[PDB]
DNA sequence: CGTTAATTAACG
DNA sequence: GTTAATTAACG
DNA sequence: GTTAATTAACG
DNA sequence: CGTTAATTAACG
DNA sequence: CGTTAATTAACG
DNA sequence: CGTTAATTAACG
């Protein structure tokens, strides 16, 4: 999934 | 940590 | 701050 | 699954 | 032109 | 893959 | 009050 | 599943 | 020397 911020 | 709005549908 | 890629 | 490399969209 | 943020790249 | 709302294009 | 073309995320 | 704070819209 | 209302992209 999307990168952690 | 949210950034800019995504493009709209 | 920039947003999503176009 | 970790991390840096590379890109690009912010500004004015 | 530079910087922060996003996205691509690597094995 | 397709839909329908949004956004960009056009001049 | 301009209108269609192109793009966008959503859906399972 | 669903709150939180950042972002964006609204007003002007 | 702009705040409030509404929206949404973050999270563990
Ligand atoms: Mg400024
Ligand atoms: Mg400045
Ligand atoms: Mg023509
Ligand atoms: Mg008033």
Residue numbers in the entry:
A (entry chain I): 27 to 31
B (entry chain G): 23 to 31
C (entry chain H): 23 to 28
What do the authors of the reporting publication say about this deposited model?
High mobility group (HMG) proteins are intrinsically disordered nuclear non-histone chromosomal proteins that play an essential role in many biological processes by regulating the expression of numerous genes in eukaryote cells. HMGA proteins contain three DNA binding motifs, the “AT-hooks”, that bind preferentially to AT-rich sequences in the minor groove of B-form DNA. The AT-hook motif is formed by a short stretch of amino acids containing a conserved core sequence, Arg-Gly-Arg-Pro (R-G-R-P), flanked by other positively charged amino acids. HMGA are abundant nonhistone architectural nuclear factors that are involved in the modulation of chromatin structure and gene expression, thus influencing a vast array of biological processes including growth, proliferation, differentiation and death.
In the present study, we elucidate the crystal structure of the complex of AT-hook 1 (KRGRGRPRK) with the DNA oligonucleotide d(CGTTAATTAACG)2 at 1.40 Å resolution. Four Mg ions also contribute to stabilize the crystal structure. The terminal bases of the dodecamers do not form Watson-Crick base pairs; instead, the terminal guanines occupy an external position and form N2-N3 hydrogen bonds with the guanines from a neighbour stacked duplex. Peptide G is fully visible in the structure. It has the conformation expected for an AT-hook; its R3-G4 region enters into the minor groove of the AT region of the EF oligonucleotide duplex. Also, the neighbouring K2 and R5 residues interact with EF phosphates and increase the stability of this AT-hook 1. The rest of the peptide extends away and shows ionic interactions with the CD oligonucleotide duplex. In summary, two peptides and two oligonucleotide duplexes present clear AT hooks: peptide G with chains E-F and chains C-D, and peptide H with chains A-B. The other I peptide stabilizes A-B and E-F oligonucleotide duplexes by ionic interactions. In contrast to AT-hook 3 which bends DNA and shows a larger minor groove widening, AT-hook 1 binds neighbouring DNA molecules and displays moderate widening of DNA upon binding.
